[PDB]
Write a protein that binds this ligand. Sequence first.
Ligand SMILES: CCCCC/C=C/C/C=C\CCCCCCCC(=O)O[C@H](COC(=O)CCCCCCC/C=C/C/C=C/CCCCC)COP(=O)([O-])OCC[N+](C)(C)C
Ligand SMILES: CCCCC/C=C\C/C=C\CCCCCCCC(=O)O[C@H](COC(=O)CCCCCCC/C=C/C/C=C/CCCCC)COP(=O)([O-])OCC[N+](C)(C)C
Ligand SMILES: O=C(O)COc1ccc(Cl)cc1
Lengths: 322, 322
Amino acid sequence: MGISWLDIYHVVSATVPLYVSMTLGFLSARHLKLFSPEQCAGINKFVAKFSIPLLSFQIISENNPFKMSPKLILSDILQKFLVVVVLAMVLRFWHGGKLGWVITGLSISVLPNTLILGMPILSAIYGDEAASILEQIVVLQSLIWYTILLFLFELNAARAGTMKILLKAWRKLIINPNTYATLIGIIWATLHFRLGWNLPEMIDKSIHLLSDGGLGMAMFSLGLFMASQSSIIACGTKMAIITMLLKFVLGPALMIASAYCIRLKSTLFKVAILQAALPQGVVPFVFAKEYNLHPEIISTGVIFGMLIALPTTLAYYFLLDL
Amino acid sequence: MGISWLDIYHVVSATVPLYVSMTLGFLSARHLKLFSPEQCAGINKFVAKFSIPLLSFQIISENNPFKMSPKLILSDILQKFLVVVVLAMVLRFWHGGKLGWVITGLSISVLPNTLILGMPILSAIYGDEAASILEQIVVLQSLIWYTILLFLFELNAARAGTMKILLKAWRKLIINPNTYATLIGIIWATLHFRLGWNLPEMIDKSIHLLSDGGLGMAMFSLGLFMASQSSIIACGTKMAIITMLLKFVLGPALMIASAYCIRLKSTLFKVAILQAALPQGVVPFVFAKEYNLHPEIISTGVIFGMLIALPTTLAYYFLLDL
Ligand SMILES: CCCCC/C=C/C/C=C\CCCCCCCC(=O)O[C@H](COC(=O)CCCCCCC/C=C/C/C=C/CCCCC)COP(=O)([O-])OCC[N+](C)(C)C
Ligand SMILES: CCCCC/C=C\C/C=C\CCCCCCCC(=O)O[C@H](COC(=O)CCCCCCC/C=C/C/C=C/CCCCC)COP(=O)([O-])OCC[N+](C)(C)C
Ligand SMILES: O=C(O)COc1ccc(Cl)cc1
């Protein structure tokens, strides 16, 4: 069946540390009362300005741009376009600030946590044939989709003529370290994998020194933020259910539609579909907190996702084989 | 001059990442204005409360108490006794508070940086045994000397009769994260090296996620604090010389005296002496900044010692080697 009992344990081992960090952050902010809200904001700003950009640079620079499969990229782009279209259509009939929910909808719908909790799960269920397609997904995710998400965040922030707002958002984006990180990362990937240049050991050691606890500190900030809320389900039960349906019932459905449209055939099809039902991630939450765009919804989604990501992933895996 | 030129590159490569993190912190605090003073204090608090204790626990757990060299421990204790007596005597006849000055002196004089700026250097200049000796010294440091320094910090904070103040310092020490970290690390090292109780990966992964970036974060905090002051050499002129002649002319000299007192022989007599003539670690800084005890003096020493680490250590190597 593939469930075994020595793989769903690998999943739990990969997931538990992210929970230990969140619990430590929450206890520190709530019961121990170490960090004031300003200090928590400073920690989150450090995560968003240094850890995340450096991790994105590493991810982009450690993958060959000339080996990425065009079909996978087309499928990912089509999924993102479809989710944008459906969210825009929904926000017209039902619901002021409409762009804010689009960013939130995209954050919790088409940005799975493929980096950490998507690697062991999928690598075990299908082997190494799924441990080289989830890096093509993660690199594309970081570069293209975090650049676009940051542009949308800046545009929304500037909103509160028309070319003035776009110009202001673009000007604030070029100063954003994430853009520089992604651009330098892709340039270095091209150079390394075409001309063979190797990064000097000093620079690699410096980057690995300053951006090694990025995931742990991100979880710490995410746990700090839930110390400032009244309940674990900050948004509410009704909104939490929608947050789950937007991540495990809509994202996977749009990914299946995109894969069918692109006609994915080999394990690419199943890995592409089953990686869209993965946990939500924390980078979207980090951005939401930094720009203060419905952080409660994102962070509430992250927890319950990471809880229920195993049963849903196994259900999708059983469905696919059928 | 006989030292192989590759050693110089090893030292420079081991030292560059720390300077890079320091420069990034300084720029973010002073030139980019990313962090307010409260946010910098929060980052330093996070480093001191979650990164340093976990790193110390790791260091203690990955050492075997039953292979420790008694002569090395006696030499290390005798250095700190000699330094304590000499510092008290000099502060007695000549010269706030004496206890605070004693703490600063014992933080700038008998607490070098061995973990990072000692292994690649003293192991690439002497051999492989030096790595084990430095590991033992670092374990002694993080186990007993950091705890004693924290107790002294708490005593100074309380002072700023005797039994009541000592009791208050003890009460404030038992809850300190470092105390619990070291007291659990020693017990776990005993259990793991006497019974084979390997630490489950679910816990090692959590500890690493929350402690890998501890060193980079400490350097970043040092850079932020240095940005807080006006000039790079904040302490002045007679506090940047009487702070380095106690770390490179007294810290090593009293180790040389203690080595003859204990009669260290072979490589030990040299590794144990040249490890004392190394730059200051950032943990004593972190502590001083947390407790606000003349942090400028420690920061200046840390900044100016990493530059002369190679000249001074080389001079000691070519002097003792005779
Ligand atoms: C068995 C495995 C070990 C598990 C830990 C259990 C230890 C023994 C049991 C209890 C004591 C432990 C208390 C620790 C919590 C901090 C101190 C405290 O106690 O919190 C605080 C003091 O914290 C602090 O400064 C900062 C928090 C430090 C958290 C430490 C996180 C890093 C931990 C590193 C240790 C590494 C351990 C290795 C684990 C792997 C082992 C295999 C005092 O508490 P309070 O009530 O007095 O005031 C608090 C309540 N108010 C605010 C209302 C007065
Ligand atoms: C030989 C040994 C020594 C070599 C050391 C090598 C690397 C050191 C380590 C990391 C890089 C140092 C940080 C660079 C920051 C650039 C400025 C910036 O990221 O944007 C900064 C903003 O930043 C920040 O807020 C965050 C600061 C932290 C930067 C983190 C960057 C992460 C990206 C890393 C990729 C770099 C890889 C190294 C190169 C490898 C390929 C050759 C904008 O200022 P601006 O001038 O770009 O535009 C400003 C325009 N206006 C003047 C109008 C304002
Ligand atoms: O981080 C550094 O470079 C200073 O070296 C040490 C770091 C942590 C401990 Cl517990 C002891 C020494």
